[PDB]
């Protein structure tokens, strides 16, 4: 068995050694490493230990992507155990399938970039909210295609991630402008399309993202500008927030009143760019419906 | 003491139940009562007359707040008094601020007040005729109209338009007081090819309706409406389908009040209309509410038809300035 | 006559000695004092000197309110010159009319508060953008009426005036909350109505305000919440911004792209609360027309 502490430092070192890798990928890798050395005997005990480890990891990091990866890992364990009743064969199958799944989710970002970069036109203006590695990768792909465009990025007041995004874009020789969080409605008329990341894709097709995403989406809808979201597949989670208040409190806080997370309805989203392809929001639910029988 | 007993009878009728069914009758009765107050009561100055009129107007408005025509007539008479006093003696704007008084006696003021009231009554007499006369400019052949409840102005509108045009009318009954049946029967007796439906079908059939023509009980300062219950849903459906919403309302239904004022806006009646007394024990534990009026925001209204013509809601404020003094809003 | 040092020093002293004074009121008082000490005899020369002092009064404190007050003062002197025609007779009358004008505009805050405090209900949740003394007076009047309500205020990141208003409102024992400029979309569903100030009312009925107002107006329209604006009469100006880019640059900047001002269309505004009364946006143009005929 792997201790709770050992799990926490494994997660933290996995994050630290590769700053470019998302939290969900590191959580999945930590869960696979935990499963690799477990010394258990029953699939019943394995699931309990796995969900306890997922609870510990969610305690360490309150991001939605971590919980989504945990749920995906649990479904993976259930699917693998469905085929094989013997525990040893199931164990080997889970290990090899986890290795393949890890490499696939590693290639996911490049797949998204290749699928997405074609939507950026020449001379267009990009509006981005905060620091997302996926939007940075798709902008890299667009630059490699010898396309010329301008980017506006907000400052993300709680932690100035937009300034980090602007520095990274300047490293790529891209004209980028930092704008205040309160000036999106002033800048939306100059942009041609809005490309933003997501920390989690909810059942109906909406997204769970940084606190300033919902107002940017509303402003884009008011001016009829396309609103594009890039997100990986392991960020799909079976949550349905009725409104902002309905979002679970474990994702808003600990990451007067300062929530770190808001929810954007699918009606304000034009297309989602995942490694599964370019999807309408209504596709996402289908995938989840296909996953749980 | 004849005037005092007339005032008491008017107040009691307002409190218990509407004697004059039509709003025009209420306006005429209020104007006649105010004229008798002006004539019979003894006053020297204009200020004492204004304060007396304010006192009886306060009593009458406190008798029944939902009936705003009495207050409208009181404020119109007050503005008439102010205008006549200004004429015989010698508007908040930027122009007034940049550019830049009662208790005086004038013997001939009373005759001017009386003649102004009389001409106001004469104008009051022919409002429905003017609205019907201009009805024909808004109805085209083979149109589909929708109406809620029973309003005499709208039925006059439709019957005048029906002499030269053929069109279909759909009347939604205004539950619980299903008075739309009476209007549908009246229009069918004129061969206007009417249809009767319940409220629940409104949004079901608004997709096949060309325009909506409705009456109202009161027009507020910002262009909002106090109408029969179910009119807000009707306006929402019309806005959803972008069908124009026409309000046929005379100028005496125009009240200088604003929506958010003490929340004594709707009128609540006995829940017997909604839930009968024969239900039994469940009535002990059930809270039944039966509003009879509804608030309609001004952005859901397309046009206002009145005895002075057609206007937009955005212009309603101006019609407030020409009818009521800003110091008579509180009354 | 003032020599570009007495004028600016007088303006700054007027603002400093009375920190509860609007910038436009201070500018109008400075212009009236300048008119008092002229030592010239010509209406054309007086108009030229006044309109030239407008630019040097707008060099410092470049807010739209100062320009609106200057335009109003110019229209006032033109109106007086129509009536009298002898500079010698007209001078005293303009002085006295300016005295009455100052006395009248000194009561605008109280008039707006008295007219607007009746729109706040018990248990309502007010949403405010930044620090404005008119909204502060309105809330003081509402408290004096024994009404109980909650208030949310944004921090107004470029200069943290939202925290200043939060302090000034906690000084009145009003339960208030401070939210980020990016949390507006998260908070709009909790608020019942929005009250914001204005730095100037444009011809069509829209408003010119701090950079974060447009987002709040759009979000309130999306959520169908009433959006109330409180502004004084002397803030009316004959400007028509077609869009955000069309507002003059002399109002955006000087207290990578940080405008201090944005424009809100009249279609997003429910009611204007001025000392002239409660108005629809369409009323404003009417007033601003009647002045110039």
């Amino acid at each position: 068995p792997m201790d709770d502490k050992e799990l926490i430092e494994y997660f933290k070192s996995q994050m630290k050694e590769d700053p470019d890798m998302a939290s969900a990928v590191a959580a999945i890798r930590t869960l696979l490493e935990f499963l690799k050395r477990d010394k258990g005997e029953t699939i019943q005990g394995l699931r309990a230990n796995l969900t306890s480890a997922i609870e510990t990891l969610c305690g360490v990091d309150s991001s939605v992507a971590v919980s989504s990866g945990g749920e995906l890992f649990l479904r993976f364990i259930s699917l693998a155990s469905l085929e094989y009743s013997d525990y040893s064969k199931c164990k080997k199958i889970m290990i090899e399938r986890g290795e393949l799944f890890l490499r696939r989710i590693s290639l996911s970002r490049n797949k998204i970039a290749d699928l997405c970069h074609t939507f950026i036109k020449d001379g267009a203006t990009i509006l981005t909210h905060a620091y997302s590695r996926v939007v940075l990768r798709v902008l890299e792909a667009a630059v490699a295609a010898k396309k010329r465009f301008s980017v506006y990025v907000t400052e993300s007041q709680p932690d100035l991630s937009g300034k980090k995004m602007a520095k990274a874009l300047c490293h790529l020789n891209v004209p980028v402008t930092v704008v205040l969080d309160a000036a999106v409605g002033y800048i939306m008329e100059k942009a041609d399309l809005v490309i933003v990341g997501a920390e989690g894709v909810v059942e109906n097709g909406g997204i769970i993202n940084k606190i300033g995403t919902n107002q940017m989406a509303v402003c884009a809808k008011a001016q009829n500008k396309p609103f594009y979201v890039v997100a990986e597949s392991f960020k799909f989670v079976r949550l349905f927030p009725l409104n902002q208040q309905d979002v679970p409190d474990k994702f808003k806080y600990k990451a007067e009143e300062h929530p770190w997370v808001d929810y954007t309805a699918p009606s304000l989203i034009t297309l989602l760019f995942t490694d599964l392809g370019v999807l309408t929001p209504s596709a996402v639910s289908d995938e989840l419906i296909k996953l749980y029988l | 003491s004849e005037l005092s007993e007339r005032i008491e009878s008017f107040v009691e009728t307002l409190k218990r139940g509407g004697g004059p069914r039509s709003s025009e009758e209420m306006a005429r009765e209020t104007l006649g009562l105010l004229r008798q107050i002006i004539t019979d009561h003894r006053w020297s100055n204009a200020g004492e007359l204004m304060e007396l009129i304010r006192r009886e107007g306060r009593r009458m408005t406190a008798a029944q707040p939902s009936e705003t025509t009495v207050g409208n007539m009181v404020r119109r008479v007050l503005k008439i008094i102010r205008e006549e006093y200004g004429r015989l003696h010698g508007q908040e704007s930027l122009h007034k601020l940049l550019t830049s008084d009662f208790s005086f006696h004038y013997a001939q003021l009373q005759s001017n007040i009386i003649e102004a009231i009389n001409e106001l009554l004469v104008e009051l007499e022919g409002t429905m005729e003017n609205i019907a006369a201009q009805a024909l400019e808004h109805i085209h052949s083979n149109e589909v109209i929708m109406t809620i409840g029973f309003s005499r102005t709208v039925e006059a509108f439709l019957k005048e338009a029906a002499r030269k045009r053929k069109f279909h009318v759909i009347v939604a009954e205004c539950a619980p007081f299903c008075q739309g049946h009476e209007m549908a029967v009246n229009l069918s007796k004129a061969g206007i090819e009417t249809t009767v439906m319940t409220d629940a079908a409104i949004f079901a059939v608004m997709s096949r309706v060309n325009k909506v023509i409705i009456g109202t009980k009161t027009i507020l300062a910002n262009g909002a409406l106090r109408a029969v219950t179910g009119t807000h849903t009707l306006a929402l459906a019309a806005k959803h389908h972008s069908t124009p919403l026409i309000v046929c309302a005379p100028m005496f239904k125009l009240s200088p009040q604003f929506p958010n004022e003490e929340d004594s806006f709707h009128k609540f009646v006995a829940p017997e209309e909604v839930l009968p007394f024969t239900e039994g024990d469940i009535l002990e534990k059930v809270s039944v509410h039966c509003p009879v009026f509804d608030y309609v925001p001004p952005e859901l209204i397309t046009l206002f038809i009145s005895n002075i013509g057609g206007n937009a809601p955005s212009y309603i404020y101006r019609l407030m300035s020409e009818l009521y003094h800003p110091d008579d809003h509180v009354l």
Side-chain angles (χ1 to χ4, degrees), chain B residues 163-185:
Chain B
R163 293 166 194 166
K164 296 208 189 113
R165 308 259 156 98
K166 300 294 187 291
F167 52 92
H168 196 59
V169 183
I170 313 176
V171 193
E173 72 188 24
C174 199
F177 293 100
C178 291
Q179 289 175 22
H181 301 174
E182 320 166 11
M183 183 177 177
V185 171

Side-chain angles (χ1 to χ4, degrees), chain A residues 140-158:
Chain A
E140 285 185 8
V143 163
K146 293 182 303 301
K147 294 184 213 266
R148 269 149 175 157
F149 56 92
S150 298
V151 170
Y152 287 96
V153 56
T154 59
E155 61 172 7
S156 302
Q157 189 39 52

Side-chain angles (χ1 to χ4, degrees), chain A:
Chain A
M2 197 183 294
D3 194 25
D4 189 312
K5 192 212 72 66
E6 259 181 39
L7 203 78
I8 297 180
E9 285 84 4
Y10 190 92
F11 189 46
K12 283 173 176 329
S13 69
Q14 183 67 41
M15 294 299 291
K16 178 174 75 70
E17 296 297 333
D18 195 346
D20 205 78
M21 176 210 294
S23 64
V25 187
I28 292 173
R29 198 170 312 250
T30 310
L31 290 176
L32 190 71
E33 169 76 17
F34 175 90
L35 180 135
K36 220 168 280 177
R37 55 179 180 176
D38 199 294
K39 312 301 181 287
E41 294 293 328
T42 73
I43 193 79
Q44 278 87 346
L46 178 60
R47 184 194 50 179
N49 299 321
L50 278 175
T51 182
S52 278
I54 293 157
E55 196 167 6
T56 292
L57 288 190
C58 284
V60 179
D61 192 354
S62 68
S63 184
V64 189
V66 171
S67 75
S68 174
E71 301 289 314
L72 205 63
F73 201 82
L74 289 182
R75 186 68 189 118
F76 158 74
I77 303 301
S78 314
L79 279 170
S81 83
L82 178 61
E83 279 154 300
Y84 307 84
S85 63
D86 181 32
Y87 180 66
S88 305
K89 304 174 48 174
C90 182
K91 188 82 174 295
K92 306 289 106 176
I93 286 296
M94 293 183 286
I95 288 187
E96 69 192 35
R97 285 185 187 180
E99 307 279 358
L100 303 180
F101 180 53
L102 280 194
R103 87 176 74 263
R104 170 72 173 79
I105 68 179
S106 293
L107 299 179
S108 178
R109 193 176 289 146
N110 301 337
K111 209 175 310 289
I112 296 174
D114 314 320
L115 296 158
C116 190
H117 76 61
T118 48
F119 276 80
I120 301 183
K121 299 299 181 160
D122 212 9
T125 313
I126 316 289
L127 183 45
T128 312
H129 176 41
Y131 184 73
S132 175
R133 196 50 181 79
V134 192
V135 301
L136 192 153
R137 182 73 182 91
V138 305
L139 294 184
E140 285 185 8
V143 163
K146 293 182 303 301
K147 294 184 213 266
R148 269 149 175 157
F149 56 92
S150 298
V151 170
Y152 287 96
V153 56
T154 59
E155 61 172 7
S156 302
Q157 189 39 52
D159 56 321
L160 310 160
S161 299
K163 297 190 178 175
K164 170 171 50 167
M165 189 71 199
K167 293 165 196 169
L169 285 174
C170 280
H171 162 261
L172 295 174
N173 296 115
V174 183
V176 55
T177 311
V178 177
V179 73
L180 285 185
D181 278 305
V184 172
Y186 168 88
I187 293 293
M188 184 74 51
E189 68 164 55
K190 286 157 96 170
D192 288 352
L193 73 165
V194 182
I195 311 188
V196 73
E199 295 182 0
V201 177
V202 291
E203 167 86 21
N204 47 333
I207 62 159
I208 296 297
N209 200 10
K210 195 84 182 295
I211 180 59
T213 307
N214 178 251
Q215 64 180 13
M216 185 180 288
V218 167
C219 287
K221 188 71 163 188
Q223 292 183 357
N224 208 331
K225 310 269 195 255
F227 188 88
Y228 294 129
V229 174
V230 291
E232 296 96 309
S233 311
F234 47 82
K235 294 181 170 176
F236 289 8
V237 60
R238 305 205 66 169
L239 293 174
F240 183 77
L242 290 179
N243 47 8
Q244 312 288 325
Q245 183 62 255
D246 198 2
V247 180
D249 282 2
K250 44 166 180 163
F251 305 141
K252 299 197 231 192
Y253 307 116
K254 294 306 287 171
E256 279 269 333
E257 183 177 1
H258 293 293
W260 282 74
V261 158
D262 68 358
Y263 152 77
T264 307
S267 47
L268 308 166
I269 301 167
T270 291
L271 286 165
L272 297 154
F273 299 94
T274 72
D275 59 357
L276 267 63
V278 185
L279 303 175
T280 67
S282 72
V284 163
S285 178
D286 188 6
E287 303 287 333
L288 288 169
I289 284 172
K290 279 184 294 180
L291 186 56
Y292 297 89
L293 192 138

Side-chain angles (χ1 to χ4, degrees), chain B residues 92-100 221-223 236 258-263 299 313-315 317-318:
Chain B
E92 282 298 326
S93 306
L94 276 161
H95 197 282
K96 298 294 283 191
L97 300 194
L98 292 197
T99 300
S100 63
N222 59 333
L236 278 175
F258 265 103
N260 280 318
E261 273 159 8
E262 300 172 355
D263 286 325
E299 69 268 14
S314 315
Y315 202 55
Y317 75 98
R318 174 71 195 183

Side-chain angles (χ1 to χ4, degrees), chain B residues 40-311:
Chain B
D40 280 30
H41 267 261
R42 295 275 58 83
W43 49 272
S44 49
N45 263 287
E48 55 202 52
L49 176 59
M50 293 177 70
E51 74 181 1
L52 167 75
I53 293 294
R54 280 181 189 264
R55 179 205 324 165
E56 277 91 8
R58 263 195 295 264
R59 289 197 60 251
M60 294 182 286
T61 49
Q64 186 64 229
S66 65
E67 191 73 44
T68 54
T69 315
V70 186
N72 296 334
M73 294 298 102
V74 169
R75 289 158 193 169
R76 289 286 297 129
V77 162
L78 274 155
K79 177 136 187 75
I80 279 160
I81 285 164
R82 280 184 188 265
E83 290 175 10
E84 295 301 322
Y85 177 85
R87 176 173 319 282
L88 276 186
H89 172 81
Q91 267 186 316
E92 282 298 326
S93 306
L94 276 161
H95 197 282
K96 298 294 283 191
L97 300 194
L98 292 197
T99 300
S100 63
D101 291 331
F102 286 91
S103 78
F104 272 23
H105 184 222
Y106 299 104
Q108 66 282 63
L109 189 84
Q110 176 152 334
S111 164
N112 311 142
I113 308 284
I114 293 308
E115 65 94 14
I117 294 185
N118 284 124
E119 61 86 20
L120 184 51
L121 276 157
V122 176
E123 167 194 358
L124 173 64
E125 189 181 356
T127 65
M128 210 163 74
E129 196 257 339
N130 295 347
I131 306 184
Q134 66 188 289
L136 205 50
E137 313 162 21
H138 303 279
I139 307 293
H140 68 82
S141 46
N142 287 317
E143 209 176 24
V144 190
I145 320 292
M146 185 180 288
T147 300
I148 189 67
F150 191 11
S151 51
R152 271 59 174 184
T153 316
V154 173
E155 83 161 356
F157 197 96
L158 294 183
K159 294 168 114 160
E160 174 92 4
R163 293 166 194 166
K164 296 208 189 113
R165 308 259 156 98
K166 300 294 187 291
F167 52 92
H168 196 59
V169 183
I170 313 176
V171 193
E173 72 188 24
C174 199
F177 293 100
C178 291
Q179 289 175 22
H181 301 174
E182 320 166 11
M183 183 177 177
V185 171
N186 281 2
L187 297 175
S188 299
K189 286 193 303 186
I192 319 182
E193 191 209 327
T194 43
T195 310
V196 194
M197 66 182 180
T198 50
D199 310 86
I202 286 176
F203 183 85
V205 306
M206 188 84 51
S207 66
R208 268 68 187 167
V209 165
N210 292 333
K211 85 172 47 172
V212 186
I213 304 186
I214 56 165
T216 192
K217 181 81 182 191
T218 291
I219 311 170
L220 305 175
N222 59 333
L225 291 177
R226 160 150 42 186
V228 295
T229 303
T231 315
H232 192 210
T233 311
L234 183 74
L236 278 175
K239 191 67 177 173
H240 187 253
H241 289 100
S242 282
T243 71
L245 185 82
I246 315 295
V247 177
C248 300
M251 284 276 93
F252 61 82
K253 294 186 162 192
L254 189 66
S255 174
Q257 295 298 109
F258 265 103
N260 280 318
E261 273 159 8
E262 300 172 355
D263 286 325
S264 64
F265 184 88
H266 322 266
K267 166 159 108 159
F268 293 94
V269 292
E272 178 87 40
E273 268 85 13
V274 169
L275 204 48
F277 197 76
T278 74
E279 293 299 314
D281 63 358
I282 65 165
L283 295 175
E284 178 191 350
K285 294 291 183 182
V286 170
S287 307
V288 194
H289 301 297
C290 184
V292 71
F293 289 130
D294 213 359
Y295 168 81
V296 191
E299 69 268 14
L300 304 170
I301 306 145
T302 303
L303 204 73
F304 271 109
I305 300 293
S306 61
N307 58 5
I308 70 169
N311 276 118

